[PDB]
Amino acid sequence: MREIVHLQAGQCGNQIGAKFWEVISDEHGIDPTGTYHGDSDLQLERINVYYNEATGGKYVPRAVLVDLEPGTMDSVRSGPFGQIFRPDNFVFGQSGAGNNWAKGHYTEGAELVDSVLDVVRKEAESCDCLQGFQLTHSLGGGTGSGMGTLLISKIREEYPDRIMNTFSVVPSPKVSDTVVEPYNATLSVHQLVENTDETYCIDNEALYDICFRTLKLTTPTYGDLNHLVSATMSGVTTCLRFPGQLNADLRKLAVNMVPFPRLHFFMPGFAPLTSRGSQQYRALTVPELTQQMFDAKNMMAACDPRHGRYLTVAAVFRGRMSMKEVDEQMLNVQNKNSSYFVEWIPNNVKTAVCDIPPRGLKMSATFIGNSTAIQELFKRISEQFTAMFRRKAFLHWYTGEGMDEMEFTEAESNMNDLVSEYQQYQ
Amino acid sequence: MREIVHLQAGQCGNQIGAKFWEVISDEHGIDPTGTYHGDSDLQLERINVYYNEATGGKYVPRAVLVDLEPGTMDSVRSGPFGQIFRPDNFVFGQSGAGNNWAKGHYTEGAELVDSVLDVVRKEAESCDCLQGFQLTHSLGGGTGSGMGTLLISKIREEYPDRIMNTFSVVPSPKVSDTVVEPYNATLSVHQLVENTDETYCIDNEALYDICFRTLKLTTPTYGDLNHLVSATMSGVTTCLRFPGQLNADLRKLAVNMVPFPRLHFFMPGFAPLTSRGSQQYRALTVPELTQQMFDAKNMMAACDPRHGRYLTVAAVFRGRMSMKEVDEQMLNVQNKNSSYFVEWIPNNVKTAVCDIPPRGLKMSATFIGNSTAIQELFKRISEQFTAMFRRKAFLHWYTGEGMDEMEFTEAESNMNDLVSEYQQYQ
Amino acid sequence: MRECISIHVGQAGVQIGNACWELYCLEHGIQPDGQMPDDSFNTFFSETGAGKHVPRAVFVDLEPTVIDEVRTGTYRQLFHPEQLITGKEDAANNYARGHYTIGKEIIDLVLDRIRKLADQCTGLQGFLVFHSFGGGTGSGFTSLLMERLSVDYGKKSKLEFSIYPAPQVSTAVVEPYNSILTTHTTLEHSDCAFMVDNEAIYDICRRNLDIERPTYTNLNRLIGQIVSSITASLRFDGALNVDLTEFQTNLVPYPRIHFPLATYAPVISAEKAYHEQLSVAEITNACFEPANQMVKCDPRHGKYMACCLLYRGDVVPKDVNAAIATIKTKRTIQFVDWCPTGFKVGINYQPPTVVPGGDLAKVQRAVCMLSNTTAIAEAWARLDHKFDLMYAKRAFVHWYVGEGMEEGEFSEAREDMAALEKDYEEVGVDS
Amino acid sequence: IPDEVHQNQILRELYLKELRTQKLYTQYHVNPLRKIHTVTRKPMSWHDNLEEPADARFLNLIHHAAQGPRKKYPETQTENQEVGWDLEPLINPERHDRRLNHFRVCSDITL
């Protein structure tokens, strides 16, 4: 019925989605060949939200991949779960961007946009009632950010009354693996703020923070990182697929998460993360979820909300539990810390309950929180951008390809107005 | 009862008709010797439409072959099903045209026409109630074009109250293999426009990119190209040979797609064809057939319907289905693509359903559409004819064989007002 | 000859309805197939010539995830499939979406199906409507349903079960936004309306029932027992009976006041029921205790002006009037000066039945109290402050404005509600 | 203006590597236990009324799908199915006794 069409942008989005499609195929019982192999009747009735129907009872995902370099497409297709996607869903370009925002937005963005638009319309017209879309992209390179902004800035005008989710990999100061990354980050956020329903800020520093402090992994490769990202991106939309005592669709989260159209940058969080040694010692109980989850270490953003105020709060729980303790613990942590909450919204917390547990666990929790602590990350990107641009850093790559110098100034003027807009609620 | 006398003209015609008669005999279950070998009784119910009964339970096709060089029918008789054909129906001259419309229409072809008319008269009388004739030829060479156009005019005055199909292979700007082929195409269509009832436009460009992108093959020999057009060749006459819910023969189609006597040009198409890698991943239902039918990449002519308006469209389906979703899919594409259909006729669809699909498949469809887009092939060959004729080039091969210079002007005048009348509906 | 139609909206109304209809089938001896293994079921079960019984309830929702478990579970064959109306895209906690955008697509279907059910009933006794103040389906779609029902049916009683939003805890952030624009609709389109706070049942189940970990099923069992005592006089004879028209007249002094508080007693586990003797004078004391209301407000701050009593089981009218007398002698409870005799009494013979795996125990006499109280102005004044501090700098107003309703309806509901708060203040002044 | 002779080949090794990496279905015909559509047959056209066998496995799965949760699962899975899970009467239903169990009984004059 309600269907979500998946998008992947750049090498980061392709690897995140490849692990994500591995996670929920195991959640819904799907082998690498594609055969349904399930032990319960509950795993099959809600499959059309993400899969199609094929001859012989096969299921193919509703995903399309966008990339400007086939050096990642061959690794995606040769992966353990690369044989499931239809070959027409793969879209590849012959001339890449080269970590450049300008290449994917102005010059090489116009040629690849026709093919990706043709395939998304051909698969979205099969939906009886389309619910929304979903995007994954990174701001550290122009392949997934130059295209990922122009595809969004087209398909909104095509489909205005739909809900749009994207996962943005915000660049980091200690994961500063690109010289021109302020330029990629700032001029994409300017387009991101005015033309997106839902954004999620995930940071590689905070991803490194969990694996060094909590999971105690010696070599946390990018497969383990995408495992953590897919853990919260699968559990955010459980209610579309699994019924519960208190269901909450992503539209139902969204209408309570944003009090203003521009306050759509959130801080996701996942509770049940425990090392191998401490797994035996720790107990799984309802206050154990909210204790670990409200711990400031467990965020996947590189800014602590202790400096700011909790603007609006959401929590999506998983598993069979009595939920008197759920309402008891949220009221306890709201009233104990009366300085981190805004005064003009009482009862800041959204709550969702899903009966079906995650695979291998009794209980879990997923957190979505809007706060004014995001103005820290925006002003730290802005100070590095204005430190480079006043000596006109890397002008010949950007000016000579077909844009004026005033596009940077209006992007900074918009972003300065963002920081001043987020300041008044603190 | 109701029968078709096949006629085969040109070297290209002999290659395409051999694959055609291999398709029909495989469809009706005929071995390479001639004796019926099948599992159903229904294949013998309507068999006189294309086959004449011989002694000993043998079946021979009622097809006549005309050619100017004996070297092609040697390959035809050395083919896999060359021994099925009657040796009397082979008609041959001692000297070929050599890609010359003038010699095949005025000098050499005026002698072989006496033998060809004698053969077709002894087969058009042997029946009881003649439905119509079909011609298969190409406009690129004078053997199948210079002889065919004169052969059309001889039959029209003999059997005026009939229907006559022709599958003309139009020349192309890219696969132009003949220097004088604008002269061949223009002089043929001048004699073809007023003396036929149905024309099909087949181009090698549309046969190539379908085998290239849609079908994903590596060695597109002429067997595979002739196999593609034989599917639409056999699918149009399915109602004649097989029972169905909505039977539609040739004249029932002809009175619907031809609103004016000078508008008899069609866009062929085939629905259920796909690649061997994506045969599995796709599902076979009438939303997929209707979606795959109407895109610009499926047309068997080198024209884009998005540059014009669909005047009349038709679709003949094969296999057991339900007809409510047959009309609903046509109703949805009628409503949503309102700009591509003319408004002076609503309900532009002609629907035919046949219960029996071709072997190796359970579901198929064939598209015949009259659209406004075919004039771009007409003006492309018109400007090439005008550029070549304004320098009075290549005329010593033509005006030395009995043609005065006003025939090209009369052909151009008949060419110009044809597209001028045809422009008025855009 | 008497018939009642049940209307359940939203996910809460469906889950309450499944718990109610479980109690109803076990009370009347109905197998989940629908056939018995003598005519009290005619008000709730339609009759089929084969022997099956079909309920007279319409389950509606705008999300298929709630109705799907009804079509899959044990009672999949008992319910008629046309009674379970399911939408495509839910309003998602938006009153404006459920009123102006989504609700008009299925308002034809639910108003057609209510006509087919009303055709089968010779004499309508009342429409029971279960709804929630918080969610969009229970707020938006319910609002224009009564606006259509007020002109479709003239004087037919439409009794209401509200889910009043909690004062201290919350499911939603925009639940005070939803729970105000429905008060305008329910003033002139509701006959009677009961209300509930969730954590009050949470306190009752934690303290009285010895259940430290309850669920919504455990709340819905206690709600269903409140429902059954009202219709018990309709389905079973007593010493003196009460009808839907009866108690609705004796508890509303004005059309603007139709919001009483229900209270059930005794609530007790099977362990403590072995200890405590439950006489009628001992169960009527629990209806006045400030810790034992189902409503999170204390009537000691306010004053009573109308009271209704529903006694069920082995009860004697002499000890009822003796217990009524000694409560009147107690000076802790206060009555208004303009209503000296504010009591109404109903008697039923049959004891209440219990379901296996339930919370309560088999009891020989039970009481339900329906008391109108001035103290609901206490909870509304708490919630009025929460609304206008949220609306002070226009929070979440862009969502409701963009659906299609104008911006003046928020202040229109505020100047309405301020008049009703002033109305209750001047009712309680002494003469 | 790309180079067609190279576009042709970069399609050729793409199709070739797709052929190398392609793995077929393991022939495990799985169908949903939900509703599947039939096209009802002609009354008189004899090719639509032959004799064919029917699968008994789908009959068993249909008769196991059209079922209640009590006799599907030994232990319940979700919290919605708690209602009506245990239906047995703890005491026998002596509904015939008009002494301890009072019901409404219709009379001859209302009917």
Ligand SMILES: Nc1nc2c(ncn2[C@@H]2O[C@H](COP(=O)(O)OP(=O)(O)OP(=O)(O)O)[C@@H](O)[C@H]2O)c(=O)[nH]1
């Ligand atoms: N008293 C009580 N209230 C409930 C129960 N279940 C849900 N609610 C109330 O319902 C409100 C939210 O609405 P839902 O029941 O989840 O669903 P809905 O009413 O259809 O609203 P939408 O989900 O937006 O369509 C919450 O604020 C709860 O107060 C219940 O079992 N008992």
Ligand SMILES: Nc1nc2c(ncn2[C@@H]2O[C@H](COP(=O)(O)OP(=O)(O)O)[C@@H](O)[C@H]2O)c(=O)[nH]1
């Ligand atoms: N969170 C996350 N970050 C990644 C991953 N892979 C790469 N990155 C970061 O992304 C940056 C490079 O992104 P890039 O591949 O150029 O993105 P593209 O240009 O869209 O293809 C590096 O600085 C990495 O830190 C991943 O799997 N997860």
Ligand SMILES: Nc1nc2c(ncn2[C@@H]2O[C@H](COP(=O)(O)OP(=O)(O)O)[C@@H](O)[C@H]2O)c(=O)[nH]1
């Ligand atoms: N579709 C198709 N086209 C063919 C085939 N064989 C030849 N042709 C085309 O026919 C053209 C040559 O026509 P030609 O044989 O000289 O015509 P003729 O002189 O009348 O016999 C070439 O340009 C080919 O593209 C075939 O088997 N199928």
Ligand SMILES: [Mg+2]
């Ligand atoms: Mg709901």
